[PDB]
Amino acid sequence: SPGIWQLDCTHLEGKVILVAVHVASGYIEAEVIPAETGQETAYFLLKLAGRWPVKTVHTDNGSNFTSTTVKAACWWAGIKQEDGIPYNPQSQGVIESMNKELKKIIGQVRDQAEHLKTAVQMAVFIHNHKRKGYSAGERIVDIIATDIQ
Protein backbone atom coordinates (compact mmCIF):
# COMPACT_ATOMS: atom_id res chain seq x y z
CA SER A 1 0.00 0.00 0.00
CA PRO A 2 2.68 2.77 0.11
CA GLY A 3 2.72 2.51 -3.77
CA ILE A 4 -1.11 2.58 -4.37
CA TRP A 5 -2.80 5.54 -6.08
CA GLN A 6 -6.39 6.07 -7.40
CA LEU A 7 -7.31 8.25 -10.35
CA ASP A 8 -10.42 10.41 -10.13
CA CYS A 9 -11.90 12.78 -12.77
CA THR A 10 -14.33 15.55 -11.65
CA HIS A 11 -15.82 18.52 -13.64
CA LEU A 12 -16.03 22.30 -12.92
CA GLU A 13 -16.51 25.31 -15.21
CA GLY A 14 -16.97 23.05 -18.28
CA LYS A 15 -13.46 21.74 -17.70
CA VAL A 16 -12.14 18.51 -16.25
CA ILE A 17 -10.01 18.18 -13.09
CA LEU A 18 -7.91 14.99 -13.07
CA VAL A 19 -6.85 13.95 -9.60
CA ALA A 20 -4.46 11.20 -8.30
CA VAL A 21 -4.94 10.31 -4.64
CA HIS A 22 -2.42 8.32 -2.65
CA VAL A 23 -4.89 6.07 -1.00
CA ALA A 24 -3.05 5.42 2.33
CA SER A 25 -2.41 9.15 3.03
CA GLY A 26 -5.06 11.15 1.21
CA TYR A 27 -2.26 13.19 -0.48
CA ILE A 28 -3.24 14.37 -3.98
CA GLU A 29 -1.80 15.85 -7.16
CA ALA A 30 -4.31 17.36 -9.69
CA GLU A 31 -4.45 19.20 -12.97
CA VAL A 32 -7.07 20.84 -15.16
CA ILE A 33 -7.40 19.54 -18.80
CA PRO A 34 -10.09 20.44 -21.40
CA ALA A 35 -11.31 16.85 -21.41
CA GLU A 36 -10.22 13.43 -20.18
CA THR A 37 -8.42 11.59 -22.97
CA GLY A 38 -6.00 8.62 -22.76
CA GLN A 39 -3.32 11.00 -24.03
CA GLU A 40 -3.80 13.44 -21.11
CA THR A 41 -4.21 10.65 -18.53
CA ALA A 42 -1.01 8.96 -19.78
CA TYR A 43 0.97 12.25 -19.47
CA PHE A 44 -0.44 12.94 -15.98
CA LEU A 45 0.63 9.42 -14.80
CA LEU A 46 4.11 9.90 -16.26
CA LYS A 47 4.47 13.20 -14.29
CA LEU A 48 3.16 11.55 -11.07
CA ALA A 49 5.42 8.51 -11.30
CA GLY A 50 8.54 10.67 -11.84
CA ARG A 51 7.70 12.49 -8.55
CA TRP A 52 6.44 9.64 -6.22
CA PRO A 53 7.12 5.83 -6.31
CA VAL A 54 3.87 4.92 -7.98
CA LYS A 55 3.56 1.09 -8.08
CA THR A 56 -0.14 0.53 -8.68
CA VAL A 57 -2.88 2.77 -10.08
CA HIS A 58 -6.58 2.11 -9.89
CA THR A 59 -7.83 3.80 -13.05
CA ASP A 60 -10.93 5.93 -12.87
CA ASN A 61 -13.00 4.37 -15.70
CA GLY A 62 -12.84 1.66 -18.38
CA SER A 63 -11.87 4.02 -21.21
CA ASN A 64 -8.61 4.90 -19.45
CA PHE A 65 -8.23 1.24 -18.34
CA THR A 66 -8.44 0.18 -22.03
CA SER A 67 -6.47 3.17 -23.52
CA THR A 68 -3.33 1.92 -25.30
CA THR A 69 -1.61 5.24 -24.55
CA VAL A 70 -2.37 4.85 -20.86
CA LYS A 71 -1.09 1.24 -20.95
CA ALA A 72 2.09 2.52 -22.73
CA ALA A 73 2.75 5.03 -19.99
CA CYS A 74 2.09 2.54 -17.25
CA TRP A 75 4.53 0.16 -18.94
CA TRP A 76 7.17 2.90 -19.35
CA ALA A 77 6.89 4.03 -15.71
CA GLY A 78 6.62 0.57 -14.18
CA ILE A 79 3.11 1.00 -12.90
CA LYS A 80 0.66 -1.93 -12.48
CA GLN A 81 -2.49 -0.68 -14.00
CA GLU A 82 -5.64 -1.87 -12.26
CA ASP A 83 -9.38 -1.29 -12.62
CA GLY A 84 -11.07 1.00 -10.14
CA ILE A 85 -13.96 -1.10 -9.07
CA PRO A 86 -14.96 -0.29 -5.52
CA TYR A 87 -14.84 -4.03 -4.70
CA ASN A 88 -14.95 -2.20 -1.39
CA PRO A 89 -18.00 0.15 -1.57
CA GLN A 90 -16.65 2.63 0.98
CA SER A 91 -14.39 3.60 -2.00
CA GLN A 92 -17.06 5.31 -4.14
CA GLY A 93 -17.99 7.30 -0.99
CA VAL A 94 -14.45 8.43 -0.01
CA ILE A 95 -13.74 9.67 -3.59
CA GLU A 96 -17.15 11.51 -3.81
CA SER A 97 -16.40 13.18 -0.50
CA MET A 98 -12.96 14.23 -1.79
CA ASN A 99 -14.44 15.81 -4.88
CA LYS A 100 -17.01 17.72 -2.80
CA GLU A 101 -14.30 18.90 -0.40
CA LEU A 102 -11.98 19.95 -3.29
CA LYS A 103 -14.70 21.83 -4.97
CA LYS A 104 -15.52 23.62 -1.69
CA ILE A 105 -11.90 24.71 -1.38
CA ILE A 106 -11.83 25.77 -4.94
CA GLY A 107 -14.82 27.97 -4.35
CA GLN A 108 -13.06 29.41 -1.18
CA VAL A 109 -10.13 30.52 -3.36
CA ARG A 110 -11.71 31.01 -6.74
CA ASP A 111 -11.76 34.81 -6.62
CA GLN A 112 -8.02 35.03 -5.92
CA ALA A 113 -7.06 33.84 -9.41
CA GLU A 114 -8.22 34.43 -12.95
CA HIS A 115 -7.76 30.82 -14.16
CA LEU A 116 -9.32 27.67 -12.83
CA LYS A 117 -6.02 25.84 -13.02
CA THR A 118 -4.51 28.27 -10.43
CA ALA A 119 -7.45 27.77 -8.08
CA VAL A 120 -7.10 24.04 -8.40
CA GLN A 121 -3.40 24.23 -7.46
CA MET A 122 -4.30 26.47 -4.46
CA ALA A 123 -6.84 23.80 -3.43
CA VAL A 124 -4.21 21.02 -3.85
CA PHE A 125 -1.93 23.05 -1.53
CA ILE A 126 -4.66 23.63 1.15
CA HIS A 127 -5.73 19.95 0.97
CA ASN A 128 -2.22 18.55 1.30
CA HIS A 129 -1.26 20.90 4.20
CA LYS A 130 -4.53 20.42 6.22
CA ARG A 131 -3.95 18.82 9.60
CA LYS A 132 -6.64 16.41 10.72
CA GLY A 133 -2.79 15.32 13.94
CA TYR A 134 -0.83 14.94 10.68
CA SER A 135 -1.46 16.35 7.17
CA ALA A 136 -1.76 14.25 4.11
CA GLY A 137 1.63 15.53 2.98
CA GLU A 138 3.22 14.48 6.24
CA ARG A 139 1.47 11.05 6.03
CA ILE A 140 2.72 10.24 2.63
CA VAL A 141 6.36 11.08 3.40
CA ASP A 142 6.15 9.06 6.69
CA ILE A 143 4.62 6.10 4.86
CA ILE A 144 7.10 6.05 2.07
CA ALA A 145 10.11 6.66 4.39
CA THR A 146 8.99 3.73 6.52
CA ASP A 147 8.76 1.62 3.29
CA ILE A 148 12.32 2.56 2.24
CA GLN A 149 13.81 1.90 5.71
Q: Is 29 helix (H, G, I), strand (E, B) or coil?
A: strand
Strand bridging mode 80-82 / 56-58: parallel
Rounded to an integer, what distance in angstroms lies between the CA atom of residue 68 and that of residue 60?
A: 15
Q: With respect to ligand ZT2, which residue has the nearer C-beta, 101 or 138?
A: 138
Contacts (CB under 8 A) with its own copies, residues 24-63? 29, 43, 46-47, 49-53
Terminal Cα distance for the chain, rounded: 15
Q: With respect to its own copies, which residue has the nearer C-beta, 61 or 118?
A: 118
- Does residue 71 belong to the site contacting ligand ZT2 (CB under 6 A)? no
What's the closest the beta carbon of residue 34 comes to ligand ZT2, in angstroms? 13
- Does residue 67 belong to the site contacting its own copies (CB under 8 A)? no
Other Cβ atoms within 10 Å of 74 Cβ, number: 23
Site for ligand ZT2 (CB under 6 A): which residue of 12, 101, 118, 143? 118
